[PDB]
Amino acid sequence: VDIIFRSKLPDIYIPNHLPLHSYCFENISEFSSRPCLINGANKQIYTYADVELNSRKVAAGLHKQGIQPKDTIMILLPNSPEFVFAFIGASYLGAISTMANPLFTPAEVVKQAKASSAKIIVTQACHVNKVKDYAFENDVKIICIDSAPEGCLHFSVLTQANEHDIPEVEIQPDDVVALPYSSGTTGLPKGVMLTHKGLVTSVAQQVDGENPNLYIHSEDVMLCVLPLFHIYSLNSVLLCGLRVGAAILIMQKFDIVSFLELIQRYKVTIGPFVPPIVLAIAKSPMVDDYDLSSVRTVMSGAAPLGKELEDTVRAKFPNAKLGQGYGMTEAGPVLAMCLAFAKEPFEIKSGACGTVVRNAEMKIVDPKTGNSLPRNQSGEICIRGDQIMKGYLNDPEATARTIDKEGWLYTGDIGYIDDDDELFIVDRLKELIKYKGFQVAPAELEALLLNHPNISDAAVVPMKDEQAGEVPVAFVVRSNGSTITEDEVKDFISKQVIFYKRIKRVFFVDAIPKSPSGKILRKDLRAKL
Ligand SMILES: Nc1ncnc2c1ncn2[C@@H]1O[C@H](COP(=O)(O)OC(=O)/C=C/C2=CCC(=O)C=C2)[C@@H](O)[C@H]1O
Ligand SMILES: [Mg+2]
């Protein structure tokens, strides 16, 4: 029998039959006039009424541009009001947003555009070159938020549409609304189908209930420095923020001065961070010149945090409850959330990544035997609930290997749950590398390396790094007679991938250690490194 773990919070009613926009704006009448989005770039403020109206206008505009229910748009933008309007606009149409890092290489953007069948790409003028040829050859519309080059439209073509022209639509709970990409537990990035039902469930698990797990209210100011094109910010900052009527303070890029100035100036109360930001707060001499006493909740997620950096937060944010959230794109994303963040807070331990969310089930499974494990025993973390993905787009085989027929998602993460129902992640079974919280799929890099005429075999694994958490490193077997150097391997990769996917070290070996099936012995390589 499976040994099942649950939240210390009771299950709540979740209205996950509601479309995502209907749910997130369910209580909008209570805070219609309140600030919703604050753009750090220009200090422009949109109210809740503004954001709902602009999203509806954009929905009508997208319809006019040919977006029908179940069609997909690609958002290729930094954090911005336009990102939000495009995302919520598509939701109103029963359509799908796929989201991508605007700093991706042309090849990376186009691969995702093709895989997702995006009909429109929403971007900035400076990135049109990345997609223009592909878009022309495939009649993909390009919409620019700043200025429109030839063969492109301006975003005003969407915002100038009449909100009353949103077509009648019957959106279903299992309809897809968001399509972030993730490599999951092995292989290449895949389209994660996140549904209305799924995202409503995930948001509710965090912010709804008499005692919400993550207590945020309509007088809070939440920093949005994490990228909205990744699921952590998209769900836990934007969607959760909207649901409770919080103000969301958007930053386009991290820089330490702007970060500190915005916190102090706007009296930021919620700080959703990742470990590199925590480390920057730890190290920067200028931090002591700022008043950070407004911050009442600091969360770290996306990568392990550690003890030294937890001490940093305590010292630098004297009024804050500090803790972690643990998510995975396929999981909706939140698996566990620090109960110190609750309206009636629970005691927590350092190094814990939270307690499994309410309205969900967790088990810990031994990879060797397949047996479910009791408390205080490490194994693979698995989760079950309405919040998880529908599956991978056009990839039932990968879906079947990732979520079983009893509804269990296998995370590829190793951890244990203690007597206080606190979850600790201790290792990663899956091949995924995390650079500053960003996914680096070694299979992608390995495919590139094997394409080189002078490389016989290759394996990409994480190496521990202070600044980035992990960096990708390559073990490379040179072809016979090859003299390819570390720098030459690095340059070959660097010309083809976004910065964070870059190989930081190459180790040249005679053979890549492999299992008798033909699979890389990655744990052995990590032990060596
Ligand atoms: N807290 C964590 N500690 C150790 N590791 C963590 C943690 N959170 C995520 N990870 C790692 O990233 C993987 C998931 O990567 P992915 O990019 O798909 O998703 C994410 O990283 C999402 C994280 C997140 C979302 C919402 C939120 O509120 C708090 C955190 C996990 O399987 C695990 O290996
Ligand atoms: Mg319906």
Curated annotation (Swiss-Prot):
Residue ranges, annotated region (SBD2): 325-392
Gene3D superfamilies: 3.30.300.30, N-terminal domain of ligase-like (3.40.50.12780)
Positions with a binding annotation for (E)-4-coumaroyl-AMP: 232, 236, 302, 325, 329, 337, 413, 428, 430, 434
Superkingdom, natural source: Eukaryota
InterPro entries: AMP-bd_C, AMP-bd_C_sf, AMP-binding_CS, AMP-dep_synth/lig_dom, ANL_N_sf
Cofactor dependency: Mg(2+)
Pathway where this protein functions: Phytoalexin biosynthesis; 3,4',5-trihydroxystilbene biosynthesis; 3,4',5-trihydroxystilbene from trans-4-coumarate: step 1/2
Protein induction: Induced by wounding and methyl jasmonate (MeJA).
Gene Ontology molecular function: any one: (E)-caffeate-CoA ligase activity
Residues holding AMP: 325, 329, 413, 430, 434, 439
Catalytic reaction annotation: (E)-4-coumarate + ATP + CoA = (E)-4-coumaroyl-CoA + AMP + diphosphate; (E)-caffeate + ATP + CoA = (E)-caffeoyl-CoA + AMP + diphosphate; (E)-ferulate + ATP + CoA = (E)-feruloyl-CoA + AMP + diphosphate; (E)-cinnamate + ATP + CoA = (E)-cinnamoyl-CoA + AMP + diphosphate
Protein name (record): 4-coumarate--CoA ligase 2
